[PDB]
């Protein structure tokens, strides 16, 4: 590799980054016109911060998200409810889900169509079980993403992960609970444990903070974000940068550019062999086979036909160089998938495989395609 | 050191992956003999057209068919082995054998009317003096007499004998390092191909003494649209066939290695190299290879082979042969059935040494830009090991899919499903493959009924894993659980 | 397991080398001694400031610190001033405020006292270098302006953001080559009249833009500066674009991240650092990661999370050295900062897969010397070797082994004073001065490791180039 | 195919790695042809103590010593014991008998009985206490097979499975039955102690080894005076196979007698036994000799058969250290020509050898220091593309450890020890050079003369040290 290749400046290319982007809602990005513009910049998930505001405030946000998707029919934004929880003022030293949090989950989260609950200050697996039970019949389409923000939740992380659907890592908050020289270790460990098990991880806090005021990040900030991507993060999350910042749109597209530059350094063939080293099921074996065949026939796209999302997730876990287009009839599965690195989505009603390749300018005529369902198909665009 | 020594049960040795070709003859003309040979492991019936006529061979075919009616699950392929070019000495005075002294002159003439003596004999090959030059060696009577060419004219050659030997009338002759100018497919061989091979349902033509790709292209042209369901298997028997092997193989559908004949054309210590080289090259492109001649010769008269015979057969299997061939052992021997059992038993012993993971890895490195069909075949073999499948199903019309899987030599049996009767027959020559004919077909119900038939045949138990593959331009890999 | 604090015995044994910048905060001998204890390996003299008299006094303080710590063999690195671009003086020395969208004239007449509308520039070739659309950064990038017009002695620019700037502030010219001598008369004077006589072991050359620059310093050093090694600093696009030709001529590389961030888009600098570290790794040339390391520690006794991660990731990229600048030169906590970096380095070395580092190096790169160095690393892993002995005159044997990043400590044995100092820049190498045959040298070295690194009856791999590999047991 | 079909020069096939053992006898006794066999490829001289007397064998040892004076080549001398033998008795009027298939044949313990077609004697007195109904007895090289139907106190009743004609005092095999006779009897004891030790034999090849006790018995028998002699158990029967692992553990090397194994086990299983045994010797670095049924047709013919050459080739490909000639050199018309042919076959088979695969297979037991250095030396030699490997050794261990990894480059072993030098004539890939007792520079000064190695790289090893030099 020559250096000149690194220094090359393209709208169509960085738009096709693999890492997913979570943006926090707030006064600065609420508007339909801004949300529509953020979708174009690469927004995948909208976070509702229930630390502030009430049900009336967040309802109008959700309606604005809904109207933003009306202008972008090809987009499917997931909505994530981030709890207040039991929240050295530089404040650190109560139930994880109290009456207020429970009211938010039951009487907003469920009826308003939120796809994820990001639960603040989770300390044990019992917390996740409590939330799971809280959701119950009516909330079965909602996924749980605990936030590891303290020593307790770090200590019980394995059992938290086993119960959870995904994880959010709050680095800034962790750095106030453990020594700063060790947070990078904790972050690496947690992402890797999430990766080996195919569960989405979101890297949160202290991302591009200076962009709240500035239209450009620092060298330090960009590099910090890049290493989260190289650690193996599925998602990167903006907080104040989008909620209260002066450049919400420019921040998202900047984030997309950081992600694209970081995914450049990613060794895809070695990432496959590493996941193979760390017996296995039929569906696991077929997903591996699919990823192998895809590089082998130099596939343009991998089609993951899925109802529950498991097939897409299983393939994404092996981090293929090829884009994964997930095809599903389930509306919530499509929403849950917005948090999975390397996956994009298409809603569908065997004709699906043929009719998808028509919609997909993702392919050229005569290019190879690897479709998967306990089966693996290899096709050529006709 | 004692697991090597334990006696092997019929249940075990009948499950060997290597395929057995048996030559038809008076020793196995009988329908009851043929049925027992099926049970012993016979997969292909060779009809040697060096002897017999269209009537006698047609009768043999009826006997094979009658045998197959007693074994309806067996699908014997029929292979026509051509006579091809033959070179023979002439007659001798009073029909009495002659002794040649070492260092003595022997004139060989092209007048085949010439009744010979110890100083002059005839050759059936009229272009002998235009083929052989001074310094060339001529082998007579299975190389028992060796003579060196000293002088050539238009209708004769003068030779010096290199050893002391006694020869009879009409004995065979070899021309080491000289191309034979006789047609590889003469009017008689053409007649055999067109007027027997096609209408009698022969599946393969094994062409004796192929010396160039032109020879194969000629046979293909000869067969034509009417002979399109027939595969061409050149026999490699001399230097010309060795030198032109890559071109021959590119045109061929499979290869037969005739070791004993090669031994009459090149030095003995080079034949083992040519066999390995040729097997490996066939393996690399997934084209079937048959190792033939000098296999279990001692079993023509003995119920047991020698140590060396069995070691020879074993090493052909370890070299990567698809097929092993019996000739006079089945055709004219006292123990045709026991010889097929012994062959099957040796194959099974040799396949014990086979490291399947290492063979798959060797092949992946061997094949360079690979096709969709091959990549799915690779994946199917790899997936089968990974899920510990009992069986691999190859659904195939042309046989390509099954041939591609077999090429990577999986530890599990390949059950090939086809609607094409000729493809079922062509696959009898492919190592590791068993066959099951199905009606024309939608893939899901075909796999479903295949598991039902495979369950009763004791190939799969309920709960076991199965890999199924269907190829051609959509390709498919499917993993299922036996119900 | 990650919540468990490290003891000093653990973290002091980190393998990454530490360069510390000299300055008033670590001027006194006692502070330098504590910094050695904390893990300082190389002393950077920053020749952007001071003179031959003041820097000589610093060297004498370094030497005095070394008398108290006889085991330390600190290398001294001279960092050239190099080319600088600077804004001019302002009316009444008052700082000026530029409003976004407003035009600013930049003139090449450095005698001009500027205002809100017009400022001077020290770089006379500015109109020759810059074209419409080029960005000019002023005062650590706090002000960005875009070129709109070029003239003979002027450039007309549009303010990209609102900012207040003072007098004589730094300027950057992203994507433009600076047509100033990388080694000017002042730099040459420093190299020849301080670098050589004063016992400097490295020249870190600021703002290297071509291999031409390196060939020049080498030619300048000549026979007399033969014991001195050249470490180009890559700080702009030109150094980047020509990186490979620079590396080929160079003895090592210093990466100036903070300065590169003033020259290229920020998202591309982490990429440049990775690519360059890898390239130095493949040819076994030492690389120093520099600037914006533990900056907040100039004022604070602890680093930020982001700072810790940045240093850790440089180690994980494969850096030989990490460098402190202001943190040791002008900071409130020079000693504590060195300890902290040594600790981060030890924590990051925890995440290193050494068998993978050996295997990847074997696929990336064979000379007799390199083969034996390769065989030595593998053999060391094959037996349960405690340390690797590298007998070397030039330091090459030691470097060739270090390149393969063995899990074992490398003890480098040398009679050469300057080789011992050169190796202070090599990751995973510790050094030992020796006068002696190839067998007598291995003997006394085994006894000195016992009085430190080897228990009774452990395997030891010894390597000697001249090319032998020896496997011994401690007895 | 062109590369395969090119005639190999004498310069090339002389440089083969596999070692050749030649059996001594009337056809090769004399110094003249013995010298000519040396530079055909003979590495080891086998003395067959089934025949001849001490004076007869002493004249041979003398002829070897004289031949080595004319080629100063260092031939190992191997003493091959007679061991236990089972034999049929004498016959009526000294005339052969033929037995018809299905016919009854009684076999008796009384060796004084002059036999009929109905009854013969056997020299093995424990026959009726060894063999049981259902066992097979093989007579005269497996010419005749009989099955045991009945056993008495001093007789066995059998049924001929085969029509065959047998003469007097023919050999007998008891497939799957242990021969309850001393493997080393008083006569074998006399041969080893009063010929082997005094006449300068380097190896004892022990016929018909059935137990590891047999090996330990010979070792104690040699004691201090025979400590420079190495023991090669021959594996010839089921007991030898069943006890192979512990036999090999006590052995210095192994001789596989295929032809005799084919008389003791089913023929289709011998190739497995040979493959297993060769591999097990390779794993442990102990030399293995492939003996019997090599180039038998060359007793009468100047050329081998297609099948014979291929059998030899696959022994080399299995990983045999040595191939052995028996009657081809002991008797037979073309002893010299047979050695050349053997060397040429070995050279062709060694063309198929995948050397990078062999090193990685041997690498695929927490290894020792000297083993690690030997691996490193093979790894380095390939990396550096060395001309030769120099192995400095007194016990031979360093040379044997290197050869085990089967390097592409020839191993020149250098030793002060006369016995070590001769012990190494049995190690594939090794050639030897005696050193007076630094030594590397003088070895390179002689290697350059022998056209083996200016500018080339050389890997030298001492066992723990490795060196890479470049010749001037």
Residue numbers in the entry:
A (entry chain D): 19 to 27, 29 to 106, 158 to 160, 193 to 195, 202 to 386, 390 to 460, 466 to 476, 480 to 492, ...
B (entry chain B): 21 to 388, 390 to 462, 464 to 494, 501 to 511
C (entry chain C): 23 to 387, 391 to 460, 463 to 479, 481 to 494, 503 to 511
D (entry chain A): 21 to 92, 94 to 385, 389 to 461, 467 to 482, 484 to 493, 503 to 511
The authors write:
Previous characterization of cytoplasmic T. gondii pyruvate kinase (TgPK1), using either parasite extracts or a recombinant purified enzyme, indicated that this enzyme was allosterically activated by glucose 6-phosphate (G6P), which enhanced its activity under PEP unsaturated conditions. We solved the structure of two different constructs of TgPK1: the full-length enzyme (Met1 to Glu531 plus its N-terminal 6×His tag), which crystallized in the absence of substrates, effectors or added ions (“full TgPK1”); and an N-terminal truncated version starting at position Ile39 (“truncated TgPK1”). In both crystals, the asymmetric unit is composed of a tetramer with imperfect D2 symmetry.
The monomers from the full length TgPK1 structure were all similar to each other, superposing over all atoms with rmsd values under 1 Å. A notable difference among the four monomers was the complete absence of electron density for the B domain in one of the chains (D), which has not been reported for any PK structure. First, the full length structure showed three monomers in an open inactive conformation and one subunit where there was no electron density for the B domain (disorder likely due to lack of crystal contacts). This is consistent with the B domain existing in solution as a continuum of open conformations. Additional disordered regions included several loops in the full length C domain (Val407-Pro409, Pro480-Thr485 and Lys515-Ser522).
